[PDB]
């Protein structure tokens, strides 16, 4: 069965979608794909509709498209965005170009929320718990989100949260400097920056320049020690520290005052500069600060996820074909 599409003009191009989606309004676009909000008549909820108009423009684009689509279809967790539908007007791989992705819109983005309210510790607690609970599930699939931002955390009027929009102030140092092999603790850094902002209401490292951003960080966590410099591989990186004035690592208890001491403890553990010593999600969920909500039995992981495609070198139409397969094979959620 093929659904009936209709055509209107938005943002300003021609959007052709199935009729289940009504009352489309543009919510803004960019270097990624245009997005309209719509009302889903099947589920009676308001949804986000994303139109990919340059998915197969090249190998880089095409593989990216297949990568994201595989991942979204695989993500099923209470605290992570899930793929509600995927469709194309194209009737055959021959005429295949545009891909639309639809997702559930929870009440608001957290960047927007933190303006409109000062958050209680009871809010931050439950908020940080769910990021970790979803992050644990993301990392269990051998995935790195790489782009944790308040703009990427949806929250609703009951303070329930979901991680969405997978991949410049919240990003771990070891990436900006191309030091090393960047592991999953890069997302824990962002969680640490996010937790700080939630408590204090102000951005923790509002860097303007790349250097400025780095400066602001070191004045808090201090400059690398003898142990970490051995672990920076390239000499460009290792010598970019030197004649830059050293700052000591600071005491966070004195930086965040009035904050819950257990919260202060957990931030010490997340914002360590050396990725090897930085805490994990599974270890974070067991932290005392979450004593109230932590349940080892309700913190699930992900079904094994086959990434073998990442090793393949294929032509566009090959990636194009594979993504079309995944679009045809999509199983919509229930309920």
């Amino acid at each position: 069965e093929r659904p009936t599409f209709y055509r209107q003009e938005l943002n300003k191009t021609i959007w052709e979608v199935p009729e289940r989606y009504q009352n489309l309004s543009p919510v803004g676009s960019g270097a990624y794909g245009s997005v309209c909000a719509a009302f889903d008549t099947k589920t009676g909820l308001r949804v986000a509709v994303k139109k990919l108009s340059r998915p197969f423009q090249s190998i880089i684009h095409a593989k990216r498209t297949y990568r994201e689509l595989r991942l979204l279809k695989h993500m099923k967790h209470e605290n992570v965005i899930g793929l509600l539908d995927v469709f194309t007007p194209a009737r055959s791989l021959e005429e295949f170009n545009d891909v639309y992705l639809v997702t559930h819109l929870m009440g608001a983005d957290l960047n927007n929320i933190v303006k409109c309210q000062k958050l209680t510790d009871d809010h931050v607690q439950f908020l940080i718990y769910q990021i970790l609970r979803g992050l644990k599930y993301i990392h269990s699939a051998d995935i790195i989100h790489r782009d944790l931002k308040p703009s990427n955390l949806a929250v609703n009027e009951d303070c329930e949260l979901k991680i969405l929009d997978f991949g410049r102030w919240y990003r771990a140092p070891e990436i900006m400097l191309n030091w090393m092999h960047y592991n999953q603790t890069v997302d824990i850094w962002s969680v640490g920056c996010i937790m700080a902002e939630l408590l204090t209401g102000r951005t923790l490292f509002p860097g303007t320049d790349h250097i400025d951003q780095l400066k602001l960080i070191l004045r808090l966590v201090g400059t690398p020690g003898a142990e970490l410099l051995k672990k920076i591989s390239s000499e460009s990186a290792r010598n970019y520290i030197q004649s830059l004035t050293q700052m000591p690592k600071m005491n966070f208890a004195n930086v965040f005052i009035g904050a819950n001491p257990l919260a202060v403890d957990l931030l010490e553990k997340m914002l360590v500069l050396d990725s090897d010593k930085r805490i994990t999600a599974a270890q974070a969920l067991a932290h005392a600060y979450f004593a109230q909500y932590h349940d080892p039995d309700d913190e699930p992981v992900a079904d094994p996820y086959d990434q073998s495609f990442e090793s393949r070198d294929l032509l566009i139409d090959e990636w194009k074909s594979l993504t079309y397969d995944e679009v045809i094979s999509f199983v919509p959620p229930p309920l």
Binding site: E78, H123, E157, C159, D295
Partner: peptide, 16 residues
Amino acid sequence: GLLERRGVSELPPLYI
């Protein structure tokens, strides 16, 4: 109902 499943009373509501 993650709060429900953890036996936690409901937090102050967030607008919007």
